[PDB]
Amino acid sequence: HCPLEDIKVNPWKTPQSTARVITLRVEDPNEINNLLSINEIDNPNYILQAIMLANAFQNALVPTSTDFGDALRFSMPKGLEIANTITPMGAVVSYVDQNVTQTNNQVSVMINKVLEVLKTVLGVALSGSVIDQLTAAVTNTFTNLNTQKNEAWIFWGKETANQTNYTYNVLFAIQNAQTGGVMYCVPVGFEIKVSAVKEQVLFFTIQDSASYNVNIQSLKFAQPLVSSSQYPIADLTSAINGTL
Amino acid sequence: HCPLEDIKVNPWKTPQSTARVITLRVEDPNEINNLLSINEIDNPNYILQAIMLANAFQNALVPTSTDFGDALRFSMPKGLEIANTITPMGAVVSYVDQNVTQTNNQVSVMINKVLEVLKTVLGVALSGSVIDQLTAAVTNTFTNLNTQKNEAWIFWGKETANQTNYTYNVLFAIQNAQTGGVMYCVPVGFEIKVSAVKEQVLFFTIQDSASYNVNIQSLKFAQPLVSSSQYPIADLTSAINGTL
Ligand code: NA
Ligand code: NA
């Protein structure tokens, strides 16, 4: 109806993504998996491979100390042991076991601190390709905990009047242009102490302020790609159930 | 080390879930899908079927009015039309096109209002089986928008100094004990007007206060179950790409 204007082009305006997001909550799996599986793939033929890596690193979870509470967390040491046993064989590119602390700071700051560690593990190129999911994943470690509180990847430890202990287990599988002929797998075990009662922590936002003492344990594992396009879907159903 | 106490059993304490959660972000799909696919399945043999339902209802998206802005939203009317064409054939159990409004109320209240509508569409039994994902999904419609802002399911409309228009498209596929021999599919098209500038809306939390004028369009579609355990994984890769 109106006159067709000449194109004004802002080179900073971010284009809308074309990426398809599919979340699966598999009720009552045959074998229990206590890792939140976050997958950034460009070829769905590597999904099976991604799931099988999550199945393997399930064995790298270990109980916390009694003084922390009754919780499971991904262990970097045990991760390395497990890594060796994984077939097809692959390489541990990097690993980390580091404490992160803050005092009377906003939750946003803590998220940034943790992000800084995971970005160091992933690397610039790798970080960039998964920046949205990575940020969201770390955000959902410290906030949005109410709807997550009873899920299989979060465990509540000791619960004093001044402090809440909890663990959080997330796994990233990455396969795209930045990965080439290998898929990257980055399990993360969070051991979190926060200066607030559970009731408050459950409804913590990025605006809230708190003191944190957090241990992060992670490693980056590169496994050569294996397409599964020729296998039946029964095999993927088996991988998800942990029976493959 | 310590004496084994007799069992104290609180019948209200919620048990930890065994459900496995897997999120897939498929970079650069062959065909674009603008629906956030949230799947609650107990048998992974119905995943393909779940994805194919999301592929179908992609065709039910329509542009908003020019006065709203340049956005896509799931249309209940067009949904009904599309529903007919879906094979294998199935039934539209229920549908809704309703406005929800609030004035100077917390975002939490709005979430509850929207939840009330979607719970009416799903029903008691159905709601209960997907209560965690449903709550999270609606929460993520009004909050946690920063990391979502450029994703394929959210569209930003007109952006005044007093108001922000945006649409949000989410789809629920449900198959469990409460569904029996059919899988349920519930697409939702949100057309949201909120009394805040985009910069504020992007970092809105449940604690924040705002006035909302929201149109919700949804329907419940029951499709008889079709296992895909015998088909190759190539077919699932094709369904995800929208080429199947
Ligand atoms: Na970001
Ligand atoms: Na809940």
Instruction: Give B133 Cα–ligand 2 centroid separation in angstroms.
Output: 8
CB within 8 Å: B21 and A150:
no
CB within 8 Å: B21 and A151:
yes
Q: What's the gap between Cα A47 and its chain centre? A: 16
CB within 8 Å: B37 and A29:
no
- Is residue A65 within 8 angstroms of chain B, CB to CB? no
DSSP string, A78-90: HHHHHHHH-SS--
Residues of A (124-163) whose Cβ lies below 8 Å from B: 129, 132-133, 135-136, 139, 144, 147-148, 150-153, 155
Q: Which of A65, A106, A233 to mutate to test the interface with B (most CBs of B within 10 A)?
A: A233
Strand-pair category, B164-175 with B36-41: parallel
Long-range contacts of B59-64 (CB under 8 A, 24+ apart): B60/B187, B61/B34, B61/B35, B61/B169, B61/B189, B64/B155, B64/B157, B64/B165, B64/B167, B64/B191
Output the six-digit token pair for A225: 């790609």
Distance CA B156, CA B164 (A): 8
B180 backbone φψ class: left, alpha, beta (φ>0; ψ -120 to 50):
left
Distance CA A153, CA A150 (A): 9
Instruction: Give A218 Cα–ligand 2 centroid separation in angstroms.
Output: 30
Q: What is the resolution of this structure in A?
A: 1.9
CA B221 to chain A, closest CA, distance in angstroms equals 19
Q: Which residue of B lies nearest to A133 if distances are taken between CA atoms? A: B147
Work out the number of other CB atoms within 10 angstroms of the CB of residue A67.
Answer: 8
Residues around the ion ligand 2 (C-beta < 5 A): B 135
Distance CA B209, CA B108 (A): 9
Residue A168 per-residue DSSP state: E
Distance CA A134, CA B156 (A): 23
Instruction: Give B108 Cα–ligand 2 centroid separation in angstroms.
Output: 13
DSSP string, A100-160: EEEEEEEHHHHHHHHHHHHHHHH-HHHHHHTHHHHHHHHHHHHS--TTTTTSTTEEEEEE-
- Is residue B84 within 8 angstroms of chain A, CB to CB? no
Q: Residues A68, A72, A77, A83: what is their CA dihedral angle, to the nearest 10 degrees?
A: -170
How was this entry determined? Answer: X-ray
CA A61 to chain B, closest CA, distance in angstroms equals 15
Closest CA to A39 of A137, A180, A167: A137
What are the residue ranges spanned by the domains of chain A?
Answer: 33-233
Q: Find the CB nearest B22 among A18, A32, A39.
A: A39
CB within 8 Å: B21 and A235:
no
Question: Alpha carbon of A26 to those of A56, A184, B49: distances in Å?
Answer: 18, 23, 15
Strands of A16-115, DSSP E: 20-26, 36-41, 61-63, 72-74, 91-106
Buried b (16+ CB within 10 A) or exposed e, B197-228: ebeebbebbbebbbbbbbbbbbbbbbbeeeeb
- Amino acid (one-letter) located at A41: I
Distance CA B149, CA B152 (A): 9
Distance CA B18, CA A131 (A): 28
**DSSP bridge pairs for A175:** A41
Distance CA B67, CA A206 (A): 33
Output the six-digit token pair for A136: 């969201």
> What does CATH list as the number for B33-233?
3.40.198.10
CB within 8 Å: A233 and B236:
yes
Instruction: Give B147 Cα–ligand 1 centroid separation in angstroms.
Output: 5
A69 backbone φψ class: left, alpha, beta (φ>0; ψ -120 to 50):
left
Work out the number of other CB atoms within 10 angstroms of the CB of residue B192.
Answer: 25
Whether the Cβ atoms of residue A5 and residue B15 lie closer than 8 Å to each other:
no
